[PDB]
Amino acid sequence: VEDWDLVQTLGEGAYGEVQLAVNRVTEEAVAVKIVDMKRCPENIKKEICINKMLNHENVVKFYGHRREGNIQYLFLEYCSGGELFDRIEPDIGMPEPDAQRFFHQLMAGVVYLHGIGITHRDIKPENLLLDERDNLKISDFGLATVFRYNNRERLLNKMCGTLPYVAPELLKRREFHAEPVDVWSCGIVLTAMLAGELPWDQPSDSCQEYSDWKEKKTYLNPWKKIDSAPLALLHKILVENPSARITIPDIKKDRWYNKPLKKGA
Numbered sequence: 441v442e443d444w445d446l447v448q449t450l451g452e453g454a455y456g457e458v459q460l461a462v463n464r465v466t467e468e469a470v471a472v473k474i475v476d477m478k479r480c481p482e483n484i485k486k487e488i489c490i491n492k493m494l495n496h497e498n499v500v501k502f503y504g505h506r507r508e509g510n511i512q513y514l515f516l517e518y519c520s521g522g523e524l525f526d527r528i529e530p531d532i533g534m535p536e537p538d539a540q541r542f543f544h545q546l547m548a549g550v551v552y553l554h555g556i557g558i559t560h561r562d563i564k565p566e567n568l569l570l571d572e573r574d575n576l577k578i579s580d581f582g583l584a585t586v587f588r589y590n591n592r593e594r595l596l597n598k599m600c601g602t603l604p605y606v607a608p609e610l611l612k613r614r615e616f617h618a619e620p621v622d623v624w625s626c627g628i629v630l631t632a633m634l635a636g637e638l639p640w641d642q643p644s645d646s647c648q649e650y651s652d653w654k655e656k657k658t659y660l661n662p663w664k665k666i667d668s669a670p671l672a673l674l675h676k677i678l679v680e681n682p683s684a685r686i687t688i689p690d691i692k693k694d695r696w697y698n699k700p701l702k703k704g705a
């Protein structure tokens with residue numbers, strides 16, 4: 441209902457909804473995110489602001505914004521593939537070559553964000569969308585924030601994200617570096633893809649499955665489905681001390697990361 445028709449509902453969250461809009465003249469599809477500022481104005485001005493900085497093949501395109509009352513309309517690349525979440529078979533995951541390719545595309549997007557001083561802070565399969573040729577795009581910058589400006593880093597203090605995906609320092613420390621948190625969440629997503637389950641409700645000393653992983657009990661049941669070469673990478677991502685945790689440039693040199701698995705189109 442805005443130059444375009446609102447054909448179907450795409451992702452009814454908390455803020456409002458994402459709809460698939462079609463232009464009735466040109467037949468062009470986009471996603472429109474609809475937020476009723478009455479039902480925050482502060483984070484939404486941050487979201488659109490972050491979104492205008494963004495330009496990359498593995499980040500959901502931003503086309504523009506109108507205010508039409510209280511109602512903000514973020515116009516956004518439509519991804520006809522839907523959520524990575526729906527390509528993960530529960531208890532099974534997906535073929536390893538598919539997982540690896542999605543993991544390459546996720547790191548490409550994350551390297552790009554971090555390079556422009558942005559952290560997403562909520563990486564999980566619900567927030568990773570697939571375009572028409574199954575290319576992965578990072579979606580939803582509503583929790584995103586700047587962690588580097590004029591080349592100076594600032595530590596984060598606000599706890600946010602989604603508990604099974606969150607790194608342990610964010611539960612333990614008053615301030616923490618933004619990039620190791622995104623890396624950790626990337627390793628939970630890789631686990632979800634290769635085992636089709638999440639390893640723990642949250643990375644707490646009070647959580648048994650998490651305790652089991654630190655004791656390297658990899659005979660148990662996320663890890664036993666995985667396979668020694670991706671598992672070795674996960675041993676380097678899911679390291680409790682954020683300073684010993686592997687970084688992205690070092691992820692790109694990992695053996696499974698560079699292992700040939702998958703054919704072309």
Ligand SMILES: NC(=O)CSc1nc2ncnc(N)c2[nH]1
Pocket residue numbers: 450451452453457458471500516517518519520522569579580
């Ligand atoms: N609820 C949210 O914050 C986003 S839901 C969503 N956003 C989308 N953008 C493009 N294509 C889709 N299928 C989309 N689904």
